[PDB]
Amino acid sequence: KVTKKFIINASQPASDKIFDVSAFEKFLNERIKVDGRVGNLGDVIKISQIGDGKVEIIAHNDLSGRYLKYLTKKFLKKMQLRDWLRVVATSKGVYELKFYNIVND
């Protein structure tokens, strides 16, 4: 049995009170699907908060960080933050949410 750890960092928007970590956790819990069906996590996938606006995921199946980025972008589009927040892979399995480049007008 192999395991994979994924980190979704949202420290800057979480401290700016733009991104809701608990709402994102609930969204991930209700949207991450195993064997083509949502609400089928069990002991395969565990989602928690490690603090400082971060969400931590243990997966024992072949869950992909591209799928996690896809669900994060879906959550941003629902929260109307898609045009202003960006998900960037910063390490192996770590995706950080950060602002796009801002020009002072």
Added chain:
Amino acid sequence: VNLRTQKRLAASVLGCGEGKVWLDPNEVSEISNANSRQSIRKLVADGLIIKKPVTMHSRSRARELNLARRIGRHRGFGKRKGTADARMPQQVLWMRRQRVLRRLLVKYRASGKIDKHLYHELYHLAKGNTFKHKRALVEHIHRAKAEKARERQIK
């Protein structure tokens, strides 16, 4: 301000068509001051010139139609437009069947299920179109073995 030269140089630098070149409309003077490929590369690095992404051509409907045709949809008489030989040649069907039959006969002779004379006789039957498929050939082989065993038991 004319930017035909700058668009041409930007296309040559980015390695794309001129229809994929985007020039920043709010710094047309800064882009117009660029007369060399070095300055064009500088503007590309600074972000004043970018390469626009390709236009979408999805394959999702083609894949959906492929799975539908694989499970058997859209194969009806209203869907066929070429002749039966044009869709699937009888020569290709015959060549596949003969290769299957000869492969099975070679395998049986190598394994020792059938002997050399029965191999030759079945080879010429297969060439003479006695067997319609591998199951038919196997059933014929089994019947021949049963008749040979009955003859050996009688003798």
Added chain:
Amino acid sequence: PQEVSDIKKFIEICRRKDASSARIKKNPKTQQIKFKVRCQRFLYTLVLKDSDKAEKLKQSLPPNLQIKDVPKRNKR
């Protein structure tokens, strides 16, 4: 380009008078080290597993032959 599999023949090639220069390429992903010597006709490459005595082969190579470590970026 030619590959040399014999340490003795590589030493003789490096001791040849037409050996202009030599370079060491380190491939950490493959965990190997390549010694490349530039002669008149051919560039000769000796491939070794990356190791301390593989590095120590430099002290066996001739001193008059210049040896350069290949940088990470081939800057023009």
Added chain:
Amino acid sequence: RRKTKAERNRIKRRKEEERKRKHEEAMKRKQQQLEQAKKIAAEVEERER
């Protein structure tokens, strides 16, 4: 007698194993020469002398 497909595949596997064994022996011989590199350099210098 006429050999079978299993025997032919076994012969092919034997040839592949022989090639891999020869390659491994060559790599070990090169490693041993790298171990005895200094003696080789001294011998080459003596031969040139």
Added chain:
Amino acid sequence: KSLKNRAIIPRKAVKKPLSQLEDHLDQLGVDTEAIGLRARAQT
């Protein structure tokens, strides 16, 4: 969206205006003065 004819320019290639980000976050209900987007904005 005009995806029939052309692709959408990626958001990372376009610099977002500070005033528009200010307005959008302000309607979303974020006190932007407490977080200081002015220092975060480049020039």
Added chain:
RNA sequence: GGAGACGACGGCGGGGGCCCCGGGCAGAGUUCUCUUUUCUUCUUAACGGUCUAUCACCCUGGAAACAGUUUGUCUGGAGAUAGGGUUUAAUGGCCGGAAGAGCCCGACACUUCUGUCGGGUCCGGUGCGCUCUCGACGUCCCUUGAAAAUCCGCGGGAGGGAAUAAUUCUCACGCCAGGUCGUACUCAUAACCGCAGCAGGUCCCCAAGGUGAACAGCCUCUGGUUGAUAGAACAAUGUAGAUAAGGGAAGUCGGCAAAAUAGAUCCGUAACUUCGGGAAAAGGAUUGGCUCUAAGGGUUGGGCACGUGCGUGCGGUUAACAACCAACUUAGAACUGGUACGGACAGGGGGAAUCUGACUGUCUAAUUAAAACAUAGCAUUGCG
């Protein structure tokens, strides 16, 4: 003596590239809802080394109860099958080249000068696909499908060669040299010709996705264009495209034009005939969607006794079994919408006769394409 050095067509097999499918990293787009989603990069040159790849050739042996064998019936006592080898042939695998390149992504710096530093560039599958190339076959000819420069092998044995060592070694490495002219750009609805920036004409190479038999028609990606005086109004008569109740050629010199037919599966098809055809003759039945069922494949793998993974001597043909993998056709059935089901596109009207020329072919560029000419066949004349 070989190479240079050679036709056209048909199917089959191998290889490269393109097309297609799956997983993974990164980026981008969509996100009312759905979509573990859709799309993009994931590349490897010449030159070499190494291991291999149809034909063919060699050795043992001697085959009827004839055998081997291709899609295609060729081969074999002039030695087949089998077993073991040798070789022509790479655009095959691995390695050097070569990751240091190129490409993709990210983080800082940055008046400019300018960049700097990180992370990756991976693993498979499929084929009556397209294109090029190679190979073995086959067909056709009252047609048999260049030459030379140049390069190599052999026959021959003239000369030249050794221990003061010799070497006149197509092996490896090393040394030296390689002049002249062309080279931009267009190759066409504006770079050529036609008096012109003229809807004409003018020789080629590369050629993506979907439907479909299909480089048909229609839609799309890369790459290109958006150039061909414009604005307003909507009379007659035009040019081009259409429809029309009832009748259905009454029209007209004349069914001119238009309409009707058309793909595919199945049933069925007369006279005449040079027996090859006529023939898709004629005349009929059907075709959408959805959910299923069935059929048609590939790879791998047998028990003992000894010697020690192979050699034997045995024993057996229910492997008629298991595991894994894979693509497209064909047939059958239920359900279901309907005015349409080859729903656009695409796409024979058919038949009874006569005259006429045997047929395929050719000509009056710019008014006549034909019973004209030619053709195969036949007959005559002249020439040793």
Added chain:
RNA sequence: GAAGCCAGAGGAAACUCUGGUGGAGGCUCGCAGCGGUUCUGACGUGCAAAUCGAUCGUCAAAUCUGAGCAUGGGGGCGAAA
């Protein structure tokens, strides 16, 4: 769908019938190309001193085509107008 070939059923044999295989033809539908049949066609001081549209013939060869070369007016060449 011609030879050639395979199998089965017969026939004393020569042959006959049936099912396949095969892929021949100055055969055939038809894309490009080549050509130029028809239309009270367009055009008629035209886009054009022969063009445009639809339709049509042919499409594996007596097919199409480039360059080099040969034949020169009392001539040449001519599937002959």
